[PDB]
Structures are given as structure tokens and as C-alpha cells.
């Protein structure tokens, strides 16, 4: 498949990802540059450095500036509504 739905359960106190990209850059969708060992993202074993995030809990990140997309992810981790985050990701490069 082009994309894969990855559920990241909040199994640790931290999420542990670093992202680049967004509408205001040459990487239109946010891309994972780092995965910290011990965080919820590394704990799920399904997220990878280079993964491009298309959606967060069904919300598209297309058109969102870097800081808006980062804020969407930060709020998905802090919310008490659910104890996980659903990331729709792709291993393919996304340049437009």
C-alpha cells in the first residue's frame, strides 16, 4: 500500500519524535527525522525515520504550516479523550 495506519499507544510518558516539513517548506507533509528510544513512538515498533505523516487521528496535515502540524501532534499526545494517536504514514517520499 501507499499509506499505512499506525496506532501509537501512549505506553510511555513521552511521544519521542522529531519532525521537519509542512506547507511552508519543500517537504509539504511533515516527515519524521528522529525517533527517541524509550518514547511511545519507538515503543510501538512501527514508526520509522523518514515516514511522512499524511494524517493524525483522521485529520489531514496537507496545507498546515510546520508549527500548526506540530501543534496537532502535541495536542493528540496530551489529550485525555483517547490513550493513543493514529498516524497515517507513507514510506514514499512526498514532494508536492
Amino acid at each position: 500500500p501507499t499509506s499505512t495506519l499506525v496506532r501509537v499507544r501512549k505506553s510511555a510518558a513521552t511521544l519521542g519524535i522529531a519532525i521537519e516539513g509542512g506547507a511552508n517548506t519543500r517537504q509539504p507533509l511533515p516527515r519524521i527525522v528522529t525517533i527517541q528510544r524509550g518514547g511511545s513512538a519507538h515503543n510501538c515498533g512501527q514508526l520509522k525515520v523518514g515516514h511522512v505523516i499524511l494524517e493524525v487521528n483522521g485529520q489531514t496535515l496537507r496545507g498546515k504550516e510546520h508549527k500548526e502540524a506540530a501543534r496537532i501532534i502535541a495536542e493528540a499526545f496530551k489529550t485525555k479523550e483517547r490513550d493513543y494517536i493514529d498516524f497515517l504514514v507513507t514510506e514514499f517520499n512526498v514532494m508536492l
Binding site: 517537504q27 510546520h66 508549527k67
Partner: peptide
């Protein structure tokens, strides 16, 4: 690796 160039932001989450 980074695909964006230095001026472009990185956010730690």
C-alpha cells in the same frame, strides 16, 4: 536524514 534545508524548522515532540 533531513530533506528540508537549515532555515526550515525542526520540532521535538
Amino acid at each position: 536524514e533531513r530533506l528540508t534545508l537549515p532555515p526550515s524548522e525542526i520540532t521535538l515532540l
